[PDB]
Amino acid sequence: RRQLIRQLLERDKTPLAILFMAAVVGTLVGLAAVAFDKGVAWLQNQRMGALVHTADNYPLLLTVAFLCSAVLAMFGYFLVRKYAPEAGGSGIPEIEGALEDQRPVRWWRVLPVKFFGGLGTLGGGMVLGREGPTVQIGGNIGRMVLDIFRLKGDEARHTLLATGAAAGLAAAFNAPLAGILFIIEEMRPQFRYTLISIKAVFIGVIMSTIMYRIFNHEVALIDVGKLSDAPLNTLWLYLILGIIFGIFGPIFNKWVLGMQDLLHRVHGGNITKWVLMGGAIGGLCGLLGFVAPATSGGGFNLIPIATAGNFSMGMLVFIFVARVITTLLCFSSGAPGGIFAPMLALGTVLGTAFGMVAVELFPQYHLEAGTFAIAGMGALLAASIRAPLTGIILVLEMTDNYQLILPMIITGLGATLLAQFTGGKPLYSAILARTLAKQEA
Template sequence: MTDNTRGTPAPERLQPSGLVRRFLSRDKTPVSVLFLAALVGLLAGLLATLFEIGVHWVSEQRTEWLRDVISSVFPLWLVAFMISAGLALVGYFLVHRFAPEAAGSGIPEIEGAMDDMRPVRWWRVLPVKFIGGLGALGSGMVLGREGPTVQMGGNLGRMVSDIFRLKDKEGRHALLASGAAGGLAAAFNAPLAGIMFVVEEMRPQFRYSLISIKCVIISAIVANIVFRSIKGQHAVITMPQYDAPMLKALWLFLLLGMFFGVFGVIFNRLITLSQDLFVRIHRNDRKRYLITGTLLGGCFGLILLYLPELTGGGIAIIPNATNGDYSISLLLILFLARVATTLLCFGSGAPGGIFAPMLALGTLFGTFFGSVAQLMFPDLGLEPGMFAIAGMGALFAATVRAPITGILLVIEMTNNYDLILPLIITTLGATMLAQVLGGQPIYSQLLLRTIKKEKLRQDNRSDVVNT
C-alpha cells in the first residue's frame, strides 16, 4: 500500500528512521559539527566548574595556612603578605613567560580570534590561564573567573577543531564561539546569558548563521548541564525574591540607569588609564613586571586580612549589601574603594576577569541609591535590593554595551524574574546615555589596544632588523 499523495510507502514514512532521514535531508547543518559543539560544551562546562572549585580550594587553603601560623613565630600580617604575593607571582610569571595573551580577562582575545586578527594558541593559553588564574584569584585580588572561563572555553573550541582537523572556516568559527558561550554559561549558571553574550556583545565578530547559532545554543546547554550536575541547580547569588515595584516608581530606575551611563563611560576610561600606568611602571621588563605584580598581590593579602570587603571578585559581598548589612555611608565608601581596587587589579594585567567586580560595583551603588530613595519616598514601598539588582545589569550594560545580556545575566543569577521591567528600564537608560556620551564597549577598547600594541611591537622589530 502506498500513499498516492506522496509516492512513499505510508508505513515507512511513519517509522522513526524515515523521519530522521527526512530531517537530515532538509537540515543542511553538518551533524558532525553539532556533535563537536556538544563536545566543546562538555569540556567548557567541566573546565569552568573545575576552575571554580579550584579557586575556592586555593582560597580555603590560604585561610588554613594563616590559621596554622597564628600561633607560630611569624607575624600574621607577614605570612598573609607572603602567601598572597607567592600566589600572585605564579599568575604573573606564567602569563609573562609563556602566554602574554592570557593576561586580563581574555575576552578581547577571543573576539579578535573570531575576526581572524588574533592567534589562538590553546596549548599555551589553557594551562597558563587555569593555573595562573588560580594563583591570581586565590591571592585575594579583585578579579572574576568569568573572563578566564570564556577565554578557556573559546580555546577549547579551537582545540577541538584542530584535533578533529576541521577545515571548514564556518565550522571552526562556530566552535570558537560555542566555547565562549559554554564558558560563560557554566561560570554564572546562566545559559541564556551565555548565548546572548556571544550574539550581542560579540556581534561585530560573530558570524551569524544557522550552524553558528545552533552550535552556540548546544554548547551553552551542555556546559550548563555539566555545571548543574556538579554544583547543583541553585542560583549563583542567594538573594530575596522581590515583587515588582509600583509603576509610579519606575522613573527612579531610569534615573539610576542614567547615573550608571555616566559612570560606565568614566569607568572604561579609568581602566585604560590604569593599564597605561602599569605599563609605565614595569615597561614590559619581566623583572619589573613580576616585582610589581608580586607586591600588588601581597598588598591584597594584607587587605584580605583586615578589610575583606575590598578583595575578591565580589559575588560574596552582593547578598550582604542587599540584606542591609551596611549603612548608607558605608555602601558609598565600599563602592568607591572597590572601584580603586578593581582598577588596580585588572589594570595590572593579572589573569582574571572584570565581570564579577562590575556586578559587585553595580550592587553597592544600586543599594546605596535604593536606600536613599527609600528614605526620600517612603510611600512607594521600595526595597534597596530592587535597585541593587537593577544596578548590576545597568553597569554591565553601560561598560560592555550589551543590555540584553545584562538583563538575562542578572535574572538568571538572582532568580528575580518579577524585576524584568525595572531591569529593562535601568539598562536602557544606562546604555543610551553611555552611547550619547561617546563611550565605547570595554572589550572593543581592549581589543583595539592589544592590536595597536602588537603592531607597534612588530614595527620596532622591523626597525631593528633594518638597522
C-alpha cells in the first residue's frame, strides 16, 4: 500500500527527454509515411501511363501490366530476402516482438528495405496495405532515434518503439486515435506491465498525423458520406453479422498461416524461387488491376463504392472471394506489406453483402446496406487480428459515422467473441508465436 501511495503521487511523470524524442519520432514517421504513400501512388501512376502508350493490343498491355507489377514485386521480395528477412510480410508481429524484447530492430536494414521494398509491392498494385510498412518503418524510426541519441533505459526503448509504431499506423489511415489504441490494445506486451508512456505515444501520433495533413488534407482516404442511422430493433442484425465475421475470422487466419507454409514450399526458402514467385503474384495483381480492379490493389477504392450499394450481390461475392485469394497470395507470400487494410476491404464487401440481404428481408427496418458495410469494415480486424477497439475506432476515424457506433461495436464484439469460441487466435500473435518458436527450434 504505502508503495502505491508513493506511486500515485508520482504517476504520469514522463522524462521530458522521452517526450521530446517522441515528437521527433512522430515527425519522422509521418514524413516517412507520406514519402512511402507518395512513392506508391507515383508507381501506380507510372504503371497507368505505360498502358495508355500500349492501350491498343489488349494482350500487349495485359503483358506490360503483368511485367511492370512483376518487376516491381520482385524488386520488393528481393530487397527483403537479401537485406532484411524480418521486413517481410506485415512488420507488426515483428515490432510486437521488439516491444517484448524478443526481436531486434535492425533499423539500418529494415528502414531502407521495408520502405523501398513495399514501394515495389504496393506500387505494383498488390493486395497489401501501408500499415505493415509504416508501422514497422515507424518502430524502426523510433529505434533509430533511440540509438542516435543514445537514450538509455527501458521506458525510452519501449516508448519510442511504441510511438514510432502508433505514428506509423496513424499516418497510414490518418487516424491518430487508432494509432494510439493499437499500441495500448494490440502492439504492447500483452502479459506484463510495460514502461510505455501513453503521453509520449500521443505526441508522436499527433506529430505524424500533422505531417500527414500537411500533404494530404482536403482529400479523405475513404469518403462514405453520412449514412443512415440504426434503430435499436435493428441491432440484433449486427450481432448476427458479427457472429459471421467471428466464425470466418479464425478460418481466414488458418488460411493466411497455411498459405504461408504452402507458399514456402514453392521456393523452399530459396531467394530466387521466392523473388520469382513474388514476381508472379505481383504481376498477377497488376494484371487484375486492369481486368478486375476490385480484386487487386489495396482495396480502399472499392470501400466507398460498396458502401453506396453500387455493386450487385454477384459482384460482391466475386470481389470477396477474389480478394480473399489475392490478399492471401500477396500477404502469405511474405511480400513486404500489410494485411490490415485488405481486411478492411474484405470487411466492407462482406458487410455490404450482409446488408443487401438484410434490406430485402426487412423492408420494415428501412435498412441501408452501407451501415452493415461500415459495421463489417473493421469486423474482420476484430475476428482475425482480435484488436476490436482499434478497429471500431479506426473505422470511425475513417468513415465518420458515429451514429453507427452501437452497430459497429456489436459487430466487432460479436466477431471477437465468435473468433474466441471457435479457437481462432490474434493473427499478429500467431505470426509472432510462429516466428518466436521457429527460432527456439
